[PDB]
Design an enzyme around this catalytic site. Structure first.
Site, short mmCIF file in Angstrom:
data_model
loop_
_atom_site.label_atom_id
_atom_site.label_comp_id
_atom_site.label_asym_id
_atom_site.label_seq_id
_atom_site.Cartn_x
_atom_site.Cartn_y
_atom_site.Cartn_z
N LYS A 14 -23.87 -12.45 -36.08
CA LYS A 14 -25.12 -11.97 -35.50
C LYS A 14 -25.18 -12.25 -34.00
O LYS A 14 -25.61 -11.39 -33.22
CB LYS A 14 -26.31 -12.62 -36.21
CG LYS A 14 -27.66 -12.37 -35.56
CD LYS A 14 -28.79 -12.86 -36.45
CE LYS A 14 -29.68 -13.85 -35.72
NZ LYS A 14 -31.08 -13.82 -36.23
N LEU A 40 -39.77 -13.69 -38.50
CA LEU A 40 -38.48 -13.60 -39.15
C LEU A 40 -37.57 -12.65 -38.36
O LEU A 40 -37.86 -12.28 -37.23
CB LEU A 40 -38.61 -13.15 -40.60
CG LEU A 40 -39.68 -13.76 -41.51
CD1 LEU A 40 -40.88 -12.86 -41.66
CD2 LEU A 40 -39.06 -14.08 -42.86
N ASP A 41 -36.45 -12.27 -38.97
CA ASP A 41 -35.46 -11.39 -38.36
C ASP A 41 -35.47 -10.04 -39.07
O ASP A 41 -36.18 -9.84 -40.06
CB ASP A 41 -34.08 -12.04 -38.40
CG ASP A 41 -33.17 -11.55 -37.29
OD1 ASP A 41 -33.66 -10.84 -36.39
OD2 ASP A 41 -31.97 -11.89 -37.31
N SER A 42 -34.68 -9.11 -38.54
CA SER A 42 -34.53 -7.80 -39.17
C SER A 42 -33.84 -7.92 -40.53
O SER A 42 -34.18 -7.20 -41.47
CB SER A 42 -33.73 -6.88 -38.25
OG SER A 42 -32.72 -7.60 -37.56
#
Ligand SMILES: CCCCCCCCCCCCCCCCCC(=O)OC[C@H](COP(=O)([O-])OCC[N+](C)(C)C)OC(=O)CCCCCCCCCCCCCCCCC
Ligand SMILES: CCCCCCCCCCCCCCCCCC(=O)OC[C@H](COP(=O)([O-])OCC[N+](C)(C)C)OC(=O)CCCCCCCCCCCCCCCCC
Ligand SMILES: CCCCCCCCCCCCCCCCCC(=O)OC[C@H](COP(=O)([O-])OCC[N+](C)(C)C)OC(=O)CCCCCCCCCCCCCCCCC
Lengths: 50, 62, 459, 155, 87, 221, 64, 70, 171, 50, 177
Positions: free
Chosen positions: K51, E41-43
């Site tokens: 992002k 996943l991501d932060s």
């Protein structure tokens, strides 16, 4: 008696009260002579107060 | 032991405060000063017996 | 008064002839016997003072001060018997002898019928406090505390003595039983102005007056606590006795001259309450609170109304007891933490509950919680100062806020909050400490039931 | 504690300034003193004058109730800048706007209260009627003086 | 009020919150499953998980400790330490 | 006529008994909140009796039962003024407090200092009931500062939390400003009416009394 | 201990009387004293001149 | 039943001090109040009477309570 | 007991309790319970203490001071008789203070016992209180905390010169 | 506390009631005023000349 | 900027902290769950749209605008957890966090009331006092010259040896005593 040091102050107080009772004797200049407290000296008495 | 609370915590304070109020506070004047009860027409004072005379008839409207 | 002076001068060899481990017990026991014996002075009449002899008398005014003094000596003896355990036995007897001599000079001060005798022993009291302050302190500044304490007070009174001698050349007698009937009114002139200044400034320094109060905090943050209690509780009352014995002769020039003194006392009591609001030491905070209380007493006796005299005497006695027990609190804290910082030791209620209770009672009695005698005296002075003028109540009102604001804050940061983690030598309550604290506190509560014994000479 | 542990006089040259900076154990450039205007401040460091609520509350402080560490050169007014005292938290609203709003609100409704005092409301009625010369005796008046007989008339 | 919780109770809770997340498949999760390595996943998803745990347990985790605990086992260890389990 | 004063002072002394009971304990007390709750229930009944008597008859009383002092002209004594106001307000407060101690039995059961908490609020109730029935102004001042100090203590109950300490100090400051107003009213009443009792103040009826009313308004604020 | 020593004991030894310090001391030392002296003074003359002429109501004022 | 421990400061010294204070005040308070109620119940408080003619009273014959007279 | 002139109280007039409705009231039952359980043992212990009082009945007397020459017949700076004059003056000061106290007690008792219409029926007490307050203010006010008979005599002298000046300027 | 509770009539304060309790009882029975504005006899004072 | 271990906050950490604080303020703004979920998805989509921006200076300026609107559009009273600082029950139970060394001050007549606990306490104290010299030996050789550069405590590198400076961090009492 092994408790001679514990009777210093009561002896001092007795001596101080004796000294005071001797001290009001010299202040009898106006005994039974005040204009507000004067009264006849009763029989079987010599002074109004010691 | 069931009725020790209602006797110790109530009755002894009543006896103590009633002794104090009856024979030490009522003897001193102007301590328990009570407002006199209101007097209405048609009443009767027990300590005298005199009756307050009846109030005049209402000029009725209803 | 020979029935109390002879016990003191006869207890003097008793503390000199005692054993190496029974000095404290014998001195405390015999001083408590003298304290019980001292209750016979209350044979008071509504018209005549109890005139014992030619050179000794005691009206309704000085008797509570005497009872406070020879009740205060055993409390000082208990409060100063911890840190002197490592001190040499001869110097221990020297310290106890100094305290005994201080009590003897104090009781001879309050009952001196002649004002010259009163002055002579009122600054014969100066030698033992100076010796105790300079020798048995704990910092370097105690040396400076021996200068500012001394060279203030004497500089106020070496004029005064001359003025007293002048009265001996004017009236012919300085006796107080005579001067109540031989007193003449004081005319308006510069000579009478300087006579008033000379007769006033010594006890103005000894209260202290604001501006001349610099000797009080510098002589309290370093003293041994016997010296701190005698200075705060009974040694400041010599100014009050000077007021209530001297102000008879200084009428009517006092009425139209004491304006700047009252202004200085009111605004300086405001200033010292504000200084209490921003202090870092317990001892300095208590000393500045004492400065505020004595400025209030100064105003109370300077306006010279009977209600003011009642309030001044009640406030004097109540403040003496409260300040002595507050110094006992600060001494317990400094004993446990070895420092005088307020912010260092916090949250002691989590560790010491009974000292927290004594802290709460001290703070409550400090801000004049009714029906304590502190509130009685403070309220009477408040009404008398409102009778002097209206606007004064404003100059009181802010103070009565501020005298609460620090009085709890000085408690709170010392008792409430998260305790300091790196302090771990907090011992539990010694029985001697709490016994001393209760012996301070219980008479202060008891006198609220029967205040008529401490309501001055004109109740 | 000795003669160079307690704070000393004002440091002038860079060398004594660095000695004072390492006396308080901080940065040499970040140690800057108060201007020597004669108020007797000394070589004490000048903090940027912020409160103590602004400190990190989640950091493991040495003193948690004060959010203060050990050996830090503390504020000149630490007693003034505790959590229990004056706070310098960043408010979501402007301070000058807050003062203007409060002053305008208070002055506006004080003026409206005084305006309503000038022009009051009432009921469309007459005065109350009381017997016996508007209760002269029951008001506490003396009975030896006969009042002026004023009567109340029906309508 | 507020019954103490064992380590298996908070473990069941954290796996329940993980299984109720759409990004986590309900089969490949474990206590030591890294978010960037095991699951990728991501932060932002990690901060989403941290907020979910904060709202579920009703207390605030500091941001540094929010970003430091990087496995479900680290979450279990931190929760069990803060609530002081096994008394 | 005689049941009145006796039962009312019994209500007061029965309220003040458990403080002396907890002050002279040598052991941990077994269900001290039950003691306080039962005592306050019996006190509520004992104070409800003169309410029925007064609403039947209409009697008002002054009980100056203990002399305190006489300074110059002024005389202060322990006097209770029980009229419609105070003696009607007392049973309502007793009922509300009885429910509040029962709810506190429910709520504060997880605190080891529960006995001190109950003692503190009982002391607050004692000084409040002193306040409501006070005859002279000095007894009302005593009750005023008593309820202020008990509010300070019961707000700074959780002494570890500093927000409670700040709130307690703020409440103390505002209450002391109110006491400044009350003390100004006290001083004016003494200096212009030569009294502190309510009867003399009401009888003399001053005309230019804007200053004491302003002081009382400040006290109420 | 460094802060507590710098708060009190290190004020006078690094003090030099200049225009700013002397001006501030004279402003905050004798100003309010003079203001209160004058206010209380004129209040005293007003009260005295009211009470000698009988205009001040002292009907019930017997406690002082 | 998961009986845990609560660390608290030692209250033995405070309790001992309170017990000693209460015992040492009661040790004389009980005989004093017993003697007071005994003289108030048996010896008896005095009564007001006018001064007779030709008989002066003592200095202690002007007060009400017997303890005050003593 | 107490003397009825120094503390006068009007006789009590209590109306007849006659029920209008048929519902009984608990006040009579509780009064009977109070008379049974409470009043009887209180009267029993009271008869006990008064019977123990009757065995030892000694008297105490009220002290009286004869009239002394006052401050007017005192030679100046001769303390031996102005001491007595000041003594008598202080005793009279205390007596006058208690007199104003008892008048205040009378006024408070009247105002409480007269109910809601006390403003009319306590006129006599208000007049007596005003007269005694004016008397005390003329006699003792503004003397100061160091009051003495010389200051009181000087104040009386100044008041007499003021009254004589007012008489002469309005003759 | 026992000594100061039963102290014999401090400053004759209770006595200050009793004689006062006599005194008004005199002057309310003979029509005399309660207290007079003259502390001493106004006929026994030599007024200075004006 | 102020951290126990670091001296500089990386822009990624600042972005994450902005996301956390802004979304917490958004949750405190709209109370209900559905509106909070919808606006949280909107904010997540906005941060996802921004992002993919690898320019440091552009993300710097975008962060500055974002912080400015976040302070411009924040609730005056954000929701604070009951144990978080600023909460209603922050440090409320701290009045019962009595440290362990108060058990040193206990009377011996009460130290026999709980014999097993006190025996366990003395053997724990013995363990600590023999491990003290070992752990100060551990710090006295692992610490760099001139003191440590960071406040991160080293672990225990040997089996059987206790962790260094382990006592006063492990000794803090339970939060519900
Ligand atoms: C704390 C430090 C400051 C202390 C200040 C103390 C108060 C200030 C005034 C004190 C003056 C000295 C005592 C005077 C007593 C006079 C009594 C009297 O009846 O006087 C009438 C007499 C009147 O003279 P006479 O009585 O001889 O004349 C006969 C009467 N007539 C006038 C009608 C003819 O006054 C004087 O003789 C002069 C009085 C003033 C003295 C001025 C010099 C001293 C100045 C103050 C110095 C203070 C100490 C400073 C240093 C301190 C230490 C560093
Ligand atoms: C459960 C056991 C209960 C007790 C059982 C044993 C006792 C039984 C009952 C008999 C009691 C004793 C006899 C009756 C009482 C004594 C009679 C008497 O003359 O007593 C002397 C006096 C009566 O007043 P007095 O009029 O004589 O007082 C004048 C006193 N001089 C002149 C010296 C100023 O005192 C008492 O009666 C004591 C009353 C105690 C109860 C009140 C407590 C007050 C608590 C608060 C104090 C602080 C208040 C501050 C504010 C005050 C108001 C402004
Ligand atoms: C004195 C100056 C120096 C200061 C330091 C002194 C050191 C030496 C100290 C020696 C010992 C102490 C001496 C002073 C003692 C003073 C007390 C005393 O004896 O008073 C006599 C007074 C005497 O009362 P009295 O004056 O009314 O009696 C008149 C006298 N006779 C009886 C002869 C007619 O005692 C009392 O007033 C006691 C009243 C009864 C006891 C208290 C009952 C109520 C208790 C509280 C109940 C709860 C209330 C609500 C609480 C709410 C929460 C707060």
């Amino acid at each position: 008696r092994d408790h001679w040091i514990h009777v210093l102050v009561p002896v001092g107080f007795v001596f101080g009260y004796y000294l005071d009772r001797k001290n009001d004797e010299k202040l009898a200049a106006f005994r039974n002579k005040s204009l507000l407290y004067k009264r006849e000296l009763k029989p079987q008495e010599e002074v109004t107060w010691k | 032991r069931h009725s020790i609370f209602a006797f110790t915590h109530v009755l002894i304070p009543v006896w103590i405060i009633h002794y104090y109020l009856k024979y030490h506070v009522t003897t001193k004047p102007y301590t328990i000063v009570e407002k006199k009860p209101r007097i209405f027409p048609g009443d009767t004072i027990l300590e005298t017996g005199e009756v307050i005379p009846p109030m005049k008839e209402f000029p009725d409207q209803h | 008064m020979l029935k109390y002076i002879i016990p003191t001068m006869m207890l003097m060899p008793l503390t000199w002839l005692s054993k190496n481990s029974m000095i404290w017990i014998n001195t405390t026991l015999h001083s408590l016997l003298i304290s019980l014996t001292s209750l016979l002075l209350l044979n008071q009449f509504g018209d005549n003072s109890l005139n014992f002899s030619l050179t000794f008398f005691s009206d309704s005014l000085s008797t509570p001060l005497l009872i406070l003094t020879m009740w205060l000596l055993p409390l000082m003896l208990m409060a100063s018997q911890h840190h002197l355990s490592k001190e040499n036995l001869a110097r221990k007897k020297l310290f106890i002898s100094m305290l005994i001599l201080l009590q003897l000079f104090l009781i001879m001060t309050f009952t001196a019928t002649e004002l010259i005798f009163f002055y002579i022993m009122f600054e014969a009291t100066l030698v033992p406090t100076l010796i105790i302050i300079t020798r048995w302190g704990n910092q370097t500044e105690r040396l400076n505390a021996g200068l500012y304490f001394l060279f203030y007070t004497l500089a106020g009174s070496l004029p005064l003595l001359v003025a007293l001698i002048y009265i001996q050349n004017t009236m012919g007698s300085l006796n107080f039983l005579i001067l109540q009937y031989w007193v003449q009114p004081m005319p308006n002139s510069w000579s009478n102005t300087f006579m008033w200044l000379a007769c006033m400034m010594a006890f103005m320094v000894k209260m202290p007056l604001y501006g001349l109060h610099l000797w009080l905090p510098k002589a309290h943050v370093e003293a041994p606590i016997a010296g701190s209690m005698v200075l705060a509780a009974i040694l400041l009352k010599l100014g009050g006795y000077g007021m209530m014995r001297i102000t008879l002769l200084l009428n009517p020039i006092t009425d139209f001259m004491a304006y700047p003194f009252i202004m200085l006392s009111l605004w300086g009591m405001i200033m010292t309450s504000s200084i209490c609001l921003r202090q870092t030491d317990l001892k300095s905070l208590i000393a500045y609170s004492s400065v505020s209380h004595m400025a209030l007493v100064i105003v109370a006796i300077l306006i010279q109304t009977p209600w003011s005299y009642m309030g001044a005497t009640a406030l004097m006695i109540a403040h003496g007891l409260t300040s002595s027990m507050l110094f006992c609190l600060a001494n317990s804290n400094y004993e446990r933490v070895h420092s005088r910082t307020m912010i260092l030791a916090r949250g002691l209620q989590t560790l010491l509950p009974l000292m927290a209770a004594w802290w709460l009672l001290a703070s409550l009695t400090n801000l004049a919680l009714p029906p304590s005698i502190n509130l009685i005296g403070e309220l009477f002075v408040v009404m008398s100062t409102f009778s002097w003028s209206n606007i004064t109540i404003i100059l009181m009102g802010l103070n009565m806020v501020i005298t609460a604001l620090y009085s709890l804050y000085m408690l709170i940061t010392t008792q409430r909050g998260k305790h300091t983690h790196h302090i771990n030598n907090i011992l539990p309550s010694f029985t001697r400490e709490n016994a001393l604290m209760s012996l301070h506190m219980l008479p202060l509560l008891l006198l609220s039931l029967n205040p008529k014994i401490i309501l001055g000479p004109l109740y | 504690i000795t003669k160079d542990m307690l704070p000393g006089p004002y440091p002038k040259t860079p060398e004594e300034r660095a000695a004072a900076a390492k006396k308080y154990n901080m940065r040499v450039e970040d140690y800057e003193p108060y201007p020597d205007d004669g108020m007797g401040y000394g070589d004490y460091p000048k903090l940027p004058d912020r409160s103590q609520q602004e400190r990190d509350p989640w950091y493991d402080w040495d003193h948690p109730d004060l959010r203060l560490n050990w050996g830090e050169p503390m504020h000149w007014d630490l007693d003034m800048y505790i959590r229990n005292r004056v706070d310098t938290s960043p408010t979501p609203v402007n301070w000058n706007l807050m003062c203007k709003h409060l002053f305008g609100f208070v002055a506006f409704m004080l003026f409206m209260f005084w305006v309503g005092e000038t022009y009051p409301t009432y009921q469309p009625v007459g005065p109350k009627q009381y017997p016996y010369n508007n209760l002269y005796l029951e008001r506490g008046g003396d009975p030896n003086k006969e009042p002026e007989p004023v009567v109340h008339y029906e309508i | 009020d507020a019954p103490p919780l064992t380590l298996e109770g908070i473990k069941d809770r954290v796996l329940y919150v993980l299984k109720l997340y759409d990004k986590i498949d309900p089969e490949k999760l474990s206590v030591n499953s890294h978010f960037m390595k095991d699951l990728g996943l991501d932060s932002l998803d990690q901060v989403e998980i941290i907020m979910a745990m904060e709202d579920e347990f009703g207390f605030e985790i500091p941001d540094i400790d929010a970003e430091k605990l990087m496995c479900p086992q680290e979450i279990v260890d931190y929760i069990a330490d803060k609530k002081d389990v096994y008394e | 006529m005689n049941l009145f004063s006796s039962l009312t002072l019994v209500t007061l002394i029965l309220l003040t008994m458990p403080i002396a009971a907890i002050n002279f304990n040598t052991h941990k007390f077994t269900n001290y909140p039950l003691y306080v709750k039962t005592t306050i229930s019996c006190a509520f009944i004992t104070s409800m009796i003169p309410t029925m008597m007064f609403i039947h008859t209409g009697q008002e009383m002054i009980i100056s039962n203990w002399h305190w002092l006489t300074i110059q002209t002024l005389k202060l004594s322990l006097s209770f003024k029980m009229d419609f106001f105070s003696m009607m307000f007392v049973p309502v407060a007793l009922f509300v407090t009885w429910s509040i101690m029962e709810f506190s039995m429910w709520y504060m059961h997880s605190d080891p200092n529960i006995n001190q908490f109950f003692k503190y609020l009982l002391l607050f109730l004692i000084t409040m009931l002193i306040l409501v029935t006070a005859n002279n102004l000095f007894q009302l001042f005593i009750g005023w500062e008593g309820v202020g100090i008990m509010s300070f203590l019961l707000i700074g109950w959780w002494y570890g939390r500093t927000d409670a300490n700040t709130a307690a100090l703020q409440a103390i400051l505002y209450n002391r400003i109110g006491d400044i107003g009350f003390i100004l009213a006290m001083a004016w009443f003494l200096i212009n009416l030569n009294t502190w009792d309510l009867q003399q103040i009401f009888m003399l009826n001053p005309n230019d009394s804007n200053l004491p009313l302003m002081g009382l308004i400040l006290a109420a604020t | 201990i460094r802060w507590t020593c710098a708060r009190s004991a290190n004020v006078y030894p690094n003090f030099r009387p200049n225009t700013k310090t002397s001006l501030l001391g004279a402003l905050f030392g004798i100003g309010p004293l003079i203001f209160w002296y004058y206010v209380f003074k004129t209040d005293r003359d007003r009260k005295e001149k009211l009470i000698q002429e009988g205009k001040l109501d002292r009907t019930f004022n017997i406690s002082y | 039943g998961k009986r845990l421990f609560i660390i608290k400061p030692s209250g033995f010294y405070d309790k001992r001090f309170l017990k000693l204070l209460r015992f040492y005040i009661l040790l004389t308070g009980i005989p004093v109040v017993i003697g007071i109620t005994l003289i108030n119940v048996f010896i008896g408080e005095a009564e007001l009477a006018e001064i007779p003619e030709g008989y002066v009273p003592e200095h202690w014959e002007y007060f009400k309570h017997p303890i005050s007279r003593w | 007991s107490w003397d009825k002139d120094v503390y006068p109280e009007p006789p009590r007039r209590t109306p007849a309790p006659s029920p209008q409705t048929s519902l009984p009231n608990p006040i009579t039952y509780l009064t009977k319970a109070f008379d049974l359980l409470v009043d009887r043992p209180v009267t029993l212990v009271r008869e006990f203490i008064e019977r123990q009082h009757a065995k030892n009945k000694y008297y105490y007397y009220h002290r009286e001071f004869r009239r002394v020459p006052d401050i007017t017949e005192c030679h100046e700076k001769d303390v031996l008789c102005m001491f007595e004059a000041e003594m008598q003056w202080k005793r009279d000061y205390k007596v006058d203070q208690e007199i104003v106290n008892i008048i205040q007690e009378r006024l408070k008792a009247c105002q409480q016992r007269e109910g809601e219409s006390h403003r009319q029926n306590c006129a006599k007490e208000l007049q007596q209180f005003t007269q005694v307050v004016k008397a005390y203010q003329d006699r003792y006010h503004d003397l100061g905390a160091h009051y003495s008979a010389r200051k009181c005599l000087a104040k009386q002298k100044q008041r007499m010169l003021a009254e004589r000046k007012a008489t002469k300027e309005a003759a | 506390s026992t000594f100061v509770a039963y102290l014999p009539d401090y400053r004759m304060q209770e006595w200050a009631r009793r004689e006062a309790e006599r005194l008004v009882k005199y002057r309310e029975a003979h029509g005399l005023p309660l207290m007079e504005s003259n502390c001493f006899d106004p006929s026994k004072i030599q007024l200075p000349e004006d | 900027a102020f951290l126990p271990s670091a001296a500089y906050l990386t822009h990624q950490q600042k972005v994450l902290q902005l996301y956390k604080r802004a979304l917490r303020h958004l949750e405190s703004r709209c109370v209900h769950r559905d509106k909070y979920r919808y606006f949280a998805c909107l904010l997540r989509a906005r941060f996802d749209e921004h992002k993919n921006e690898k320019d440091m200076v552009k993300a710097t300026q975008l962060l500055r605008e974002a912080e400015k609107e976040f302070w411009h559009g924040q609730h005056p009273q954000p929701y604070i957890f009951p144990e978080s600082p600023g909460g209603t029950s922050y440090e409320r139970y701290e009045c019962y966090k009595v440290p362990e060394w108060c058990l040193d001050d206990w009377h011996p007549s009460e130290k026999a009331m709980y014999p097993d606990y006190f025996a366990k306490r003395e053997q724990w104290k013995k363990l600590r006092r023999e491990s003290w010299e070992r752990e100060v030996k551990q710090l006295q050789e692992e610490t760099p010259v001139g003191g440590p550069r960071t406040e991160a405590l080293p672990p225990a590198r040997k089996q059987g040896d206790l962790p260094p400076l382990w006592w006063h961090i492990v000794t803090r009492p339970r939060e519900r005593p």
